[PDB]
Ligand binder design. Structure first.
Ligand SMILES: NS(=O)(=O)c1ccc2c(c1)[C@H]1CCC[C@H]1[C@@H](c1ccccc1Cl)N2
Ligand SMILES: [Zn+2]
Length: 257
């Protein structure tokens, strides 16, 4: 009876195995745009993905992860609110059963159709497993998806999903360029938070871009054909794999006016 997104094992249950679910810096949150304060001392984000090395795509039973070689500084995030160098390890998405829901963060209570998370770890901690034990261990770049025009740089991901339909399936996924998933503007909000799934560790500097990317209805429909279940188990569509907004408790900063 492990955690998931169902009635009996979803977000309102997670605190029984993971008491930090009720902690002081949980994610996601609602971004109240009028309450966020412009921080003129915040630096532009530096997103250096030209040497990114994608390896594989995995259905882990909760989402699909596109994994990268993080054994050298090859795709890194720096600047913004960050001190030092954060290495890209993987990206994944959260999405809805309907276009009106799916994002984890919300903007003035607005839900987007989906949310992309580019996960990076602070190289001063040596490995990802050490970094998640630290309050400044991770930097997650969050990008909203709205339904409209197709995102051409997403299509190579959409077209491989048939090969990883079920939990535990993986496929080779080399030479994927994550620059094709980035909006024009790097204007962002930032706050200290957590992983949005168990183990819900409070190790994340969240950086959430203001400008969404557009994807087509056909692209997100293909996300919704994935399965939470393993092969030869009853089919349960992988939809609504998002945690709702958590209390802000004790400030969201904006990079822009
Ligand atoms: N929705 S998200 O971007 O906040 C998110 C949620 C859960 C997980 C991740 C990212 C990645 C990033 C940090 C930990 C790692 C993962 C995990 C896997 C292997 C080993 C340890 C851990 Cl903690 N769990
Ligand atoms: Zn995520």
């Amino acid at each position: 009876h492990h955690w998931g997104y169902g009635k009996h094992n979803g977000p309102e249950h997670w605190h029984k195995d993971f008491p930090i679910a009720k902690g002081e810096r949980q994610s996601p949150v609602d971004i109240d745009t009028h309450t966020a304060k412009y921080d003129p001392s915040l630096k532009p984000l530096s997103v250096s993905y030209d040497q990114a090395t994608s390896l594989r795509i995995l259905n882990n039973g909760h989402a699909f992860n596109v994994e990268f070689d993080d054994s050298q500084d090859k795709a890194v995030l720096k600047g913004g609110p960050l001190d030092g160098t954060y290495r890209l390890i993987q990206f994944h998405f959260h999405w809805g059963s309907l276009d009106g829901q799916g994002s984890e963060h919300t903007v003035d209570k607005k839900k987007y159709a989906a949310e992309l998370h580019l996960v990076h770890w602070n190289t001063k901690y040596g490995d990802f497993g050490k970094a998640v034990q630290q309050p400044d261990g991770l930097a997650v770049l969050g990008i909203f998806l709205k339904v409209g025009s197709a995102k051409p740089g997403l299509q190579k991901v959409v077209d491989v999903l048939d090969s990883i339909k079920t939990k535990g399936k993986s496929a080779d996924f080399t030479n994927f360029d994550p620059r094709g998933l980035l909006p024009e503007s790097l204007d962002y909000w930032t706050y200290p938070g957590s992983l949005t799934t168990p183990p819900l560790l409070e190790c994340v500097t969240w950086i959430v871009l203001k400008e969404p990317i557009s994807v087509s209805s056909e692209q997100v429909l293909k996300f919704r054909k994935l399965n939470f279940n393993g092969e030869g188990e009853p089919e349960e569509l992988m939809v609504d794999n998002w945690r709702p907004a958590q209390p802000l408790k004790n400030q969201i900063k904006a990079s822009f006016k």
